[PDB]
Amino acid sequence: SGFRKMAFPSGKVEGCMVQVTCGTTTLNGLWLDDTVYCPRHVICTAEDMLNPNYEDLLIRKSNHSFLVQAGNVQLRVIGHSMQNCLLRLKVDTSNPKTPKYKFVRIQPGQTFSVLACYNGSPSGVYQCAMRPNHTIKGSALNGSCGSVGFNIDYDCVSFCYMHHMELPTGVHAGTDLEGKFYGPFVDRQTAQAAGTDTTITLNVLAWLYAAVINGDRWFLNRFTTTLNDFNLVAMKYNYEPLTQDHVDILGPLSAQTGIAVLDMCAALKELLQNGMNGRTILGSTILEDEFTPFDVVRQC
Amino acid sequence: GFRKMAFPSGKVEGCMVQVTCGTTTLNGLWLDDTVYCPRHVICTAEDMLNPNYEDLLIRKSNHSFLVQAGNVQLRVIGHSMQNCLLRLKVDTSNPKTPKYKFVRIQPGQTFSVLACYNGSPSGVYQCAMRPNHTIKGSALNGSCGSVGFNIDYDCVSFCYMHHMELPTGVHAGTDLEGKFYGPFVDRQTAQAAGTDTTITLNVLAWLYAAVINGDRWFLNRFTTTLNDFNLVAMKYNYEPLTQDHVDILGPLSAQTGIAVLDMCAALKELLQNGMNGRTILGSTILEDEFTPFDVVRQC
């Protein structure tokens, strides 16, 4: 493609990955300073996940009930507390590879990088968006419990995600770095359904501007639509409503190109009605919605 | 699986430097005491029309190149030229040098690229070497000197460095030896590129990936020959499937329980009739940037 969906360089996070073992269960952990962050469902067995009373089970454990390991180096755990759906493990050694960090809660439609980690060891990095239905798309390895989502601003890593659950159909449900879930999910193996997932209009529009800056112009027209007219057609083709709050955000990209939001909205309208019809936008034959206006400006 | 993910770039990030010569500044690969970069930095905008690298380099001293790692600027104490690359010896061995190898990959194979803007690592993505020996992208999707690599345990296998942006929007590069992929040359001119076919081998691997993940609505009871398949493939711009290709998918074929040639008859139908608006692994369009090796790695 002419526009690559780029993850952040995973270096500053690679050095923060460990494995957390409790009984037979083993998953990834985030080692920052003298604390290891991991999903709380680690203390549960395959049987315990059916209906887990965590406080009831966690009390049956002690510091030594936890195998934390950074590569070959073994970490002595000297305390444990529970914060929502996270396990907070206090360790005897502080992490010398700790980057300048922050904990954030991203909005649906916002993007980040996920470092998929296989039993403490990192395996790969990809870029994604928090879908409107509060889920992350994925597979067997895409989200291995404890694998984290992050943005890197200059030298500051802002952790926003942690994989916790895999839904029925390769859909991943997780938590922020406070243990608070994203959307209406819970950490227990029962029947969980995803909501009506929609296409993030704001990001698609940004991508069309990204398109324009790279010379691609064939989709642009003379017609000019109203905001209300657009939302009608948007909802028809399963697109997220465009709010007035959204058009303010496209301002910078609009200025950059001299193409008003609504005029670009009359272009998207025709693209929804008619499609590419043999043609391409930035190498793609489909309309990408995983590029936030921030990502575009940053990468252009 | 679903996501086209790249290898973690931590080991590679610490190998990136910038190299300034004259008015140009690009990305460079710092391994041990050497630095590798596109030899064309020494050229001006005009020089690139008909460059003479021998003549241009001869009146360049060691001072002409300015190499800095993050902030700490390296002193360049020697400059040779290997093919289309610049080999600048610096006064220091990279303290962050990983176990590494140089390799030259076949067209249709995959690797991670670390895009960089003047030494600073920007982003990371996964891509495949197109059959016409190119890589698609924008301006920042691989600013020159950016490196392509794979990771096998302790070792980093470097395979690509960006050199040229072509008219069409595609990119040409070399192996970390200095030899271009395809019929491309490091001078600013028109460049006849080969037809960009669809990687049959990769589409098939990706269809096996779907089966493994419980996505099998595109299977049929129909059959085909390798010969009958390619006449449909050639028509829809898919490059011919070879016996060699059929052998590589053997392991996947066992595992999945579906024979290679049947999976071709499964593909044959999807190429002819479209997808009816359905999804294979959440995708509406067939993917071809996943090798058989990639599929097995991510399961």
Q: Which residues of A169-197 are buried (b: 16+ CB within 10 A; e: fewer)?
A: ebbbbbbbbebebbeebebebeeeebeee
Of B15, B21, B37, B40, which residue is the catalytic one? B40
Query: Which of B122, B285, B298 is nearest residue A285 as measured by Cβ atoms?
Result: B285
CB B263 within 8 A of CB B208: yes
- Judge: B2–A139 Cβ closer than 8 Å, yes or no: yes
Instruction: Return the amino acid letter for A37.
Output: Y
Distance CA A192, CA A228 (A): 35
Instruction: Return the amino acid letter for B207.
Output: L
Distance CA B160, CA B149 (A): 7
Query: Two tokens at A45?
Result: 């067995």
Domain match, A184 and A210 both: no
CB A101 within 8 A of CB A16: no
> What is the number of structural domains in chain A?
3
Count Cβ atoms below 10 Å from residue A105 Cβ, excluding itself.
14
Of B21, B84, B144, B159, which residue is the catalytic one? B144
Domain match, B56 and B143 both: no
HEC per residue, chain A: CCCCCCECCCHHHHCCEEEEEECCEEEEEEEECCEEEEEHHHHCCCCHHHCCCHHHHHCCCCHHHCEEEECCEEECEEEEEEECCEEEEEECCCCCCCCEEEECCCCCCCEEEEEEEECCEEEEEEEEECCCCCCEECCCCCCCCCCEEEEEECCEEEEEEEEEEEECCCEEEEECCCCCECCCCCCCCCCCCCCCCCECHHHHHHHHHHHHHCCCCCCCCCCCCCHHHHHHHHHHCCECCCCHHHHHHHHHHHHHHCCCHHHHHHHHHHHHHCCCCCCCECCECCCCCCCCHHHHHHHC
Beta bridge partners of A7: B124
Experimental method: X-ray
Quick check: is A41 catalytic?
A: yes
Distance CA B88, CA B42 (A): 12
Structural Rg of chain A based on CA atoms: 22
Distance CA A279, CA B193 (A): 20
Name the packing angle between helices A244-257 and A201-213 (round to 10°).
Answer: 0
Query: Two tokens at B160?
Result: 């690509």
Query: Which of A124, A128, A140 is nearest residue B6 as measured by Cβ atoms?
Result: A124
From residue A64, how far is each of A60, A70, A79, A86, A190 by CA, in Å?
Answer: 12, 16, 9, 18, 30
Q: How many residues does chain A have?
A: 300
Query: Chain B contact for A3, CB < 8 A?
Result: yes
CB B36 within 8 A of CB B176: yes
Q: Could you tell me the CATH number of the domain that includes residue A214?
A: 1.10.1840.10
Domain match, B204 and B293 both: yes
Please state the separation of Cα A63 from the chain's center in Å: 31
Domain match, B146 and B282 both: no
From residue A212, how far is each of A199, A246, A255, A280, B99 by CA, in Å?
Answer: 20, 19, 12, 13, 42
Which position has the token pair 């430097």? Answer: B17
Q: To 10 degrees, the CA torsion angle through A129, A131, A134, A135?
A: -80
Beta bridge partners of A165: A173
Q: Say what the resolution is, in angstroms.
A: 2.9
Distance CA A60, CA A57 (A): 5
* Closest residue in chain A to residue B141, using alpha carbons only: A4
Distance CA A74, CA A152 (A): 28
Cβ-based burial of A71 (10 A; exposed 0-12, middle 13-18, buried ≥19): exposed
Domain match, A73 and A214 both: no
Q: What residues have CB less than 8 Å from A278, skipping those under 6 apart?
A: none
Beta bridge partners of A129: A111
Q: What residues have CB less than 8 Å from A67, skipping those under 6 apart?
A: A19, A20, A21, A22, A26, A74
Query: Two tokens at A70?
Result: 């950074």
CB B183 within 8 A of CB B145: no
Q: What is the DSSP string of chain B?
A: ----PBPP-HHHHTTEEEEEETTEEEEEEEETTEEEEEGGGGS-TTGGGS--HHHHHHT--GGGEEEEETTEEEPEEEEEEETTEEEEEESS--TTPPEEEE--PPTT-EEEEEEEETTEEEEEEEEE--TTS-EE--SSTT-TT-EEEEEETTEEEEEEEEEEE-TTSEEEEE-TTSPBSSS--SSSS---PPP--B-HHHHHHHHHHHHHTT--SS--S----HHHHHHHHTTTTBPPP-HHHHHHTHHHHHHHT--HHHHHHHHHHHHHH--TT--BTTBSS------HHHHHHT-
A-chain residues near B6 (CB < 8 A):
7, 124-126
Distance CA B176, CA B189 (A): 23
Distance CA B281, CA A169 (A): 10
CA–CA min distance B292, chain A (Å): 16
Name the packing angle between helices A261-273 and A244-257 (round to 10°).
Answer: 100
B170, B196, B222: which is the final residue of a domain? B196
Domain match, B258 and B117 both: no
Domain match, B191 and B82 both: no
Cβ-based burial of B118 (10 A; exposed 0-12, middle 13-18, buried ≥19): middle
Domain match, A166 and A208 both: no
CA–CA min distance B137, chain A (Å): 4
A46, A72, A99: which is the final residue of a domain? A99
Domain match, B189 and B222 both: no
Distance CA A116, CA A143 (A): 6
A165, A197, A229: which is the final residue of a domain? A197
Q: What residues have CB less than 8 Å from B139, skipping those under 6 apart?
A: A214, A300, B165
Domain match, B171 and B238 both: no
Instruction: Return the amino acid letter for B275.
Output: M
Distance CA A234, CA B175 (A): 47
Phi and psi at residue A86, in whole multiples of 5°?
-95, 155
From residue A56, how far is each of A2, A53, A123, A174 by CA, in Å?
Answer: 53, 5, 34, 23
Domain match, B113 and B40 both: no
* Closest residue in chain B to residue A142, using alpha carbons only: B3
The residue segments making up the domain with residue A240 are 198-300
Q: Could you tell me the CATH number of the domain that includes residue A189?
A: 2.40.10.10
Domain match, B201 and B296 both: yes
Beta bridge partners of B151: B156
The order of strands in the sheet holding B24-31 is B72-74, B65-69, B16-21, B24-31, B34-38, B85-90, B76-82
Please state the separation of Cα B175 from the chain's center in Å: 10
